[PDB]
Design a protein around this ligand. Structure first.
Ligand SMILES: OC[C@@H]1[C@@H](O)[C@H](O)[C@@H](O)CN1CCc1ccc(CCNc2cc(Cl)cc(-c3cccnn3)c2)cc1
Length: 765
């Protein structure tokens, strides 16, 4: 039965618009298969289209905004795109139609509407680019009846092992096709849809823009060669219309020119399914998707007061839809330093310089290939898997569709190597590498990241203890299925746990260090003078200088998180011997957090270092780090320490801004210094954890229940209203929020853990 659900899941999720790095495109969850992508640009001149054409996601003054209005990876969704440069409001509706044995069918409608400022007679070039990778597979454009191009639809017929037989139709569409009275029309037609079918080696098919342009440039060279010149030149849009040449190949370019508003359909019909997909099918299934989307949202994300109004609902739908809409399938080789240079052990004083020297040996090589099915933080700026981000992304996603979340967790854990390491940043294949300078691609097997994916696991567990509709919850509704999933993941869970304890160990024994346990102590590998990238809190101030005797209270707290998850999961699987070992680790961490990290003087947790005189010194920087045992749900609800942390959290002069909790206290000497990434701004993910822990304390008998209730109430309110107000004004989710002004700053399109706001509004943790 577990096997069966797995197969149904695979079939359900196979197709999607799983290329979030581009404005619109599709691919199945198969590394070498059929991919599509959309491009458009106005043409006003002989040289402008190279600058106007859109393909990969960006965000600048030329683009008002874009994102998903509704989305569910089982069903499809609707995206709208507001393009200032090209004077166009675009809608891309995508829908999946189950059937056959090959992952079903799908359709999309592309609709472009000129805005009020666009010239009513704008010419817009639109291209649908289709590529297929694989050795024993075929794809052919059925030739036109007409001389120079297609009057009606374009039919591509193809076949592969993965997909069987299929057809892909790009329909005629609606809208004015401009017509050229130029001489050239005798050779190139007056203007019509054209197709060029081509072949390149599989590994470069992803380079759609250069492939398109090479074809355009060859068209222009031909014009020059055949005496079309500046004495009497064809219009721009005709100069940029490819010569029709459909055929066989692994690349098919379908180009249309439209004047004014336009729309057209793409119909992918899986032969093994019933009849082929039609435009009437598309319209109906889009209508049905929206309906179902609405019904699910109201149940899953029922916004509580004072966010029950329709303005907040629209906001919630957009934040949620952009987050789940970001889901991608990535495939390819990654860049990894597998030297395990001894300098990476960071055992000496001044280790960072040693580590730099090892890096400058440049032993990193490509390995894999790997695949990953994941949501991402940022379509325009970093459309790829980040390890601790995904823990946050999956929290709202799991509400929506627990089976989807488990699928993504499973996908991440399948990356894990023999030692228990998953790179914190997953750059798979040349397409993904194109977005990343070479200097930042290399992953290091000694670099951890917070294991926030356990948080998702914890939620699954609690849910477990207490057809698309069916499939979405099958792993909770069938407790047998749930347990098998856990049985199978559990060893990698344990492996990662052991990996943390092996590779990120702090040093008690070699110093004047007294604590309940000689074992429980942690130090993030990879820190430099100004940074600790692996912790997730890039420039939060740490002991200076960095030192092998450092201990990090956030890292120990993450280990606590993992061990508690292991207790619950082990217990479920009857892994008795393990659960005894875990229990003693938890007990030791509980004590050692205290012995090694608690500052009575300061009233909070501090990281630790080793002095000039070799003694254990606390290094206190009031901020998110300071709160970690609380944030990670480690403290008892009656803990006097918790009560002091509650005081710090509520304290306006320290962490509490009208906009949420500040990353670093205004009293800290490093407040608002350097790049000020984590040195003051409000981050939704850490605020999310605060809000969750406040609510836990608030709904249990105890001494701080009422303080917790007040802080919960207000923090929820401040965080939601801040993200809402900026969304209202800018159309964007942002990376972080200014505690003085409330303004979103750093990058936009951060969906991204900022989308946690839909669960904050939802409440009832
Ligand atoms: O969320 C994932 C991670 C977290 O895991 C970490 O914990 C956190 O510390 C950071 N997070 C992001 C890590 C990150 C940040 C930044 C870049 C470079 C992006 N390049 C770029 C290019 C252009 Cl053309 C414009 C702009 C741009 C525009 C407007 C405003 N600001 N910038 C940016 C890569 C990766």
């Amino acid at each position: 039965l577990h096997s069966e659900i797995g197969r149904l899941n695979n079939q359900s999720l196979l197709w999607g618009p799983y290329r979030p790095n581009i404005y619109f495109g599709t691919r199945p969850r198969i590394g070498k298969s059929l991919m599509t992508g959309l491009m458009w640009g106005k043409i006003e001149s002989y040289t402008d289209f190279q600058h106007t054409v859109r393909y990969t996601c960006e965000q600048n003054e030329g683009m008002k905004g874009y994102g998903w209005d509704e989305y569910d990876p089982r069903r499809g969704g609707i995206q709208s795109i507001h393009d200032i440069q090209n004077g166009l409001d675009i809608t891309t509706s995508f829908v999946k139609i189950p059937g056959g044995a090959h992952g079903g069918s799908w359709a999309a409608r592309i609709k472009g509407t000129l805005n009020d400022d666009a010239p009513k007679d704008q010419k817009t070039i639109v291209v649908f680019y289709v590529s297929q990778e694989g050795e024993n597979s075929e794809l052919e454009a059925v030739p036109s009846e007409n001389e120079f191009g297609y009057e009606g639809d374009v039919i591509l017929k193809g076949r592969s092992e993965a997909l069987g037989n299929y057809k892909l139709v790009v329909t005629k569409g609606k809208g004015v096709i401009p017509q050229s009275d130029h001489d050239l029309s005798r050779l190139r037609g007056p203007g019509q849809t054209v197709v060029q079918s081509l072949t390149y080696p599989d590994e470069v098919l992803w380079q759609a823009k250069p492939i398109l342009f090479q074809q355009l440039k060859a068209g222009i060279d031909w014009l020059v060669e055949n005496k079309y010149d500046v004495a009497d030149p064809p219009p721009p849009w005709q100069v940029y219309l490819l010569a029709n040449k459909p055929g066989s190949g692994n690349v098919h370019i379908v180009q249309k020119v439209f004047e004014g508003d336009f729309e057209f359909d793409i119909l992918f019909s899986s032969e093994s399914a019933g009849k082929e997909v039609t435009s009437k099918d598309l319209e109906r299934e889009v209508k049905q998707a929206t309906e179902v989307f609405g019904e699910r949202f109201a149940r899953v994300f029922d916004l509580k007061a004072p966010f029950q109004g329709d303005n907040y609902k629209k906001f919630g739908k957009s934040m949620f839809s952009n987050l789940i809409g970001g889901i991608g399938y990535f495939y390819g080789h990654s860049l990894v330093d597998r030297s395990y240079a001894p300098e990476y052990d960071e055992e000496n004083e001044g280790f960072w310089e040693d580590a730099a020297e090892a890096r400058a040996r440049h032993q990193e090589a490509l390995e894999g290939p790997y695949e990953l099915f994941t949501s991402i933080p940022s379509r325009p700026f970093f459309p790829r898997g980040f390890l601790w981000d995904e823990g946050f992304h999956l929290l709202p996603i799991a509400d929506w569709d627990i089976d989807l979340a488990l699928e993504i967790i499973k996908s991440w854990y399948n990356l894990m190597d023999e030692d228990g390491w998953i790179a914190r940043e997953q750059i798979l294949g040349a397409e993904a590498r194109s977005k990343v300078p070479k200097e930042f691609q290399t992953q290091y097997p000694h670099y951890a990241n917070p294991p926030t994916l356990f948080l998702v696991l914890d939620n699954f567990v609690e849910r477990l203890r207490k057809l698309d509709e069916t499939l979405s919850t099958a792993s909770v509704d069938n407790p047998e299925v749930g347990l098998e999933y856990l049985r199978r993941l559990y060893p990698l869970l344990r492996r990662q746990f052991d990996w943390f304890r092996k590779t990120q160990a702090g040093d008690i024994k070699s110093y004047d260090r007294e604590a309940y346990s000689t074992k429980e102590a942690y130090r993030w590998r990879g820190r430099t003078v100004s940074h600790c990238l692996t912790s997730g809190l890039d420039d939060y101030p740490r002991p200076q200088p960095p030192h092998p005797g450092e201990l990090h209270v956030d890292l120990m707290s993450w280990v606590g998180v993992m061990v508690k998850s292991l207790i619950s999961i082990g217990s479920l699987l009857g892994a008795t011997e393990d659960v005894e070992f875990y229990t003693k680790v938890l007990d030791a961490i509980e004590h050692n957090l205290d012995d090694l990290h608690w500052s009575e003087k300061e009233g909070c947790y501090c990281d630790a270092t080793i002095d000039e005189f070799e003694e254990h010194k606390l290094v206190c920087h009031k901020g998110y780090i300071s709160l970690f045992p609380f944030l990670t749900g480690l403290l008892k609800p009656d803990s006097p320490k918790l009560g002091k942390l509650l005081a710090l959290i509520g304290d306006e002069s320290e962490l509490w801004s009208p906009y949420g909790l500040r990353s670093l206290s205004k009293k800290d000497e490093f407040y608002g210094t350097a790049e000020n990434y984590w040195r003051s701004p409000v981050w939704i993910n850490i605020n999310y954890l605060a809000i969750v822990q406040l609510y836990n304390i608030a709904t249990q008998d105890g001494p701080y229940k009422e303080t917790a209730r007040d802080l919960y109430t207000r923090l929820r309110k401040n965080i939601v209203e801040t993200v809402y107000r900026n969304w209202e004004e800018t159309g964007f989710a942002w990376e972080q929020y200014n505690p003085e002004t409330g303004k979103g700053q750093r990058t936009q399109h951060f969906t991204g853990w900022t989308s946690l706001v839909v669960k904050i509004m939802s409440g009832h943790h």
